[PDB]
Design an enzyme around this catalytic site. Structure first.
Site, PDB file in Angstrom:
ATOM      1  N   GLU A  35       0.796  -1.224   0.000  1.00 51.14           N
ATOM      2  CA  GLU A  35       0.000   0.000   0.000  1.00 51.14           C
ATOM      3  C   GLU A  35       0.831   1.277   0.000  1.00 51.14           C
ATOM      4  O   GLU A  35       0.539   2.205  -0.756  1.00 51.14           O
ATOM      5  CB  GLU A  35      -0.958   0.049   1.194  1.00 51.14           C
ATOM      6  CG  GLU A  35      -2.098  -0.953   1.151  1.00 51.14           C
ATOM      7  CD  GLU A  35      -3.099  -0.711   0.036  1.00 51.14           C
ATOM      8  OE1 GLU A  35      -3.098   0.381  -0.577  1.00 51.14           O
ATOM      9  OE2 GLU A  35      -3.903  -1.631  -0.220  1.00 51.14           O
ATOM     10  N   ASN A  46      -7.686   9.688  -5.649  1.00 56.39           N
ATOM     11  CA  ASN A  46      -8.414   8.855  -6.606  1.00 56.39           C
ATOM     12  C   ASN A  46      -9.335   9.785  -7.399  1.00 56.39           C
ATOM     13  O   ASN A  46     -10.428  10.137  -6.941  1.00 56.39           O
ATOM     14  CB  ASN A  46      -9.219   7.775  -5.879  1.00 56.39           C
ATOM     15  CG  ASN A  46      -8.347   6.908  -4.971  1.00 56.39           C
ATOM     16  OD1 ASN A  46      -7.451   6.186  -5.435  1.00 56.39           O
ATOM     17  ND2 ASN A  46      -8.591   6.993  -3.673  1.00 56.39           N
ATOM     18  N   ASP A  49     -13.316   9.053  -8.127  1.00 57.56           N
ATOM     19  CA  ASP A  49     -14.390   9.235  -7.147  1.00 57.56           C
ATOM     20  C   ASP A  49     -14.152  10.339  -6.111  1.00 57.56           C
ATOM     21  O   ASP A  49     -14.897  10.450  -5.135  1.00 57.56           O
ATOM     22  CB  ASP A  49     -14.736   7.908  -6.444  1.00 57.56           C
ATOM     23  CG  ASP A  49     -13.808   7.591  -5.271  1.00 57.56           C
ATOM     24  OD1 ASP A  49     -12.586   7.813  -5.381  1.00 57.56           O
ATOM     25  OD2 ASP A  49     -14.311   7.127  -4.232  1.00 57.56           O
ATOM     26  N   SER A  51     -11.921  10.689  -3.773  1.00 59.65           N
ATOM     27  CA  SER A  51     -11.513  10.267  -2.441  1.00 59.65           C
ATOM     28  C   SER A  51      -9.984  10.182  -2.413  1.00 59.65           C
ATOM     29  O   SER A  51      -9.358  10.129  -3.455  1.00 59.65           O
ATOM     30  CB  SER A  51     -12.134   8.901  -2.093  1.00 59.65           C
ATOM     31  OG  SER A  51     -11.519   7.842  -2.814  1.00 59.65           O
ATOM     32  N   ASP A  53      -6.549   8.207  -0.293  1.00 61.50           N
ATOM     33  CA  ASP A  53      -6.032   7.150   0.561  1.00 61.50           C
ATOM     34  C   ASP A  53      -4.908   7.786   1.358  1.00 61.50           C
ATOM     35  O   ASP A  53      -4.071   8.484   0.787  1.00 61.50           O
ATOM     36  CB  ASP A  53      -5.501   6.016  -0.301  1.00 61.50           C
ATOM     37  CG  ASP A  53      -6.568   5.446  -1.204  1.00 61.50           C
ATOM     38  OD1 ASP A  53      -7.687   5.251  -0.707  1.00 61.50           O
ATOM     39  OD2 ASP A  53      -6.292   5.212  -2.395  1.00 61.50           O
ATOM     40  N   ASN A  60      -8.877   4.922   3.129  1.00 58.02           N
ATOM     41  CA  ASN A  60      -9.732   5.792   2.321  1.00 58.02           C
ATOM     42  C   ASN A  60     -10.653   6.798   3.050  1.00 58.02           C
ATOM     43  O   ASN A  60     -11.342   6.462   4.028  1.00 58.02           O
ATOM     44  CB  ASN A  60     -10.531   4.910   1.355  1.00 58.02           C
ATOM     45  CG  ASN A  60     -11.212   5.702   0.263  1.00 58.02           C
ATOM     46  OD1 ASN A  60     -12.369   6.092   0.407  1.00 58.02           O
ATOM     47  ND2 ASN A  60     -10.511   5.920  -0.846  1.00 58.02           N
TER      48      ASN A  60
END
Ligand code: NA
Length: 130
Positions: A35, A46, A49, A51, A53, A60
């Site tokens: 990750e 992202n 959408d 959002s 991380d 998220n």
């Protein structure tokens, strides 16, 4: 902060991640590795959408922490996403525990399925004394 492999393994064990909700320490290590590369300040937007991380576990903002700019988002971990960018990972660990408390468990992260599931993950904790 970019953790060294065994340094992180020992810290996670101390924070009670080994066997949490049935998830072995080596699985948590595999997840952090893919990750963020064990980097606590890692952020990933992202575009699809709106959002983002955050942190070592790339948690998220749509469901877990609040950053104020993600549409229709909730804050299940009850934390500002800023908390997930500190060098001290205590809050990031408390939130990761919250994530796996949901039915999907560790499967909530697609990277885990792709890079860790059904694999020999022993390498992630070998020689760390955990
Ligand atoms: Na949120």
């Amino acid at each position: 902060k970019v953790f060294e492999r065994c340094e992180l393994a020992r810290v996670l064990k101390r924070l009670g991640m080994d066997g949490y909700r049935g998830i072995s320490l080596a699985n948590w290590m595999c997840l952090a590795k893919w990750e963020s590369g064990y980097n606590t300040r890692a952020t990933n937007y992202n575009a699809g959408d709106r959002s983002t991380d955050y942190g070592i576990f790339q948690i998220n903002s749509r469901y877990w922490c609040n950053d104020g700019k993600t549409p229709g988002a909730v804050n299940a971990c009850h934390l500002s996403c800023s908390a997930l960018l500190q060098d001290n990972i205590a809050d990031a660990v408390a939130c990761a525990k919250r994530v796996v408390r949901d039915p999907q468990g560790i499967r909530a992260w697609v990277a885990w399925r792709n890079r860790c599931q059904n694999r020999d993950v022993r390498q992630y904790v070998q020689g760390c004394g955990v």
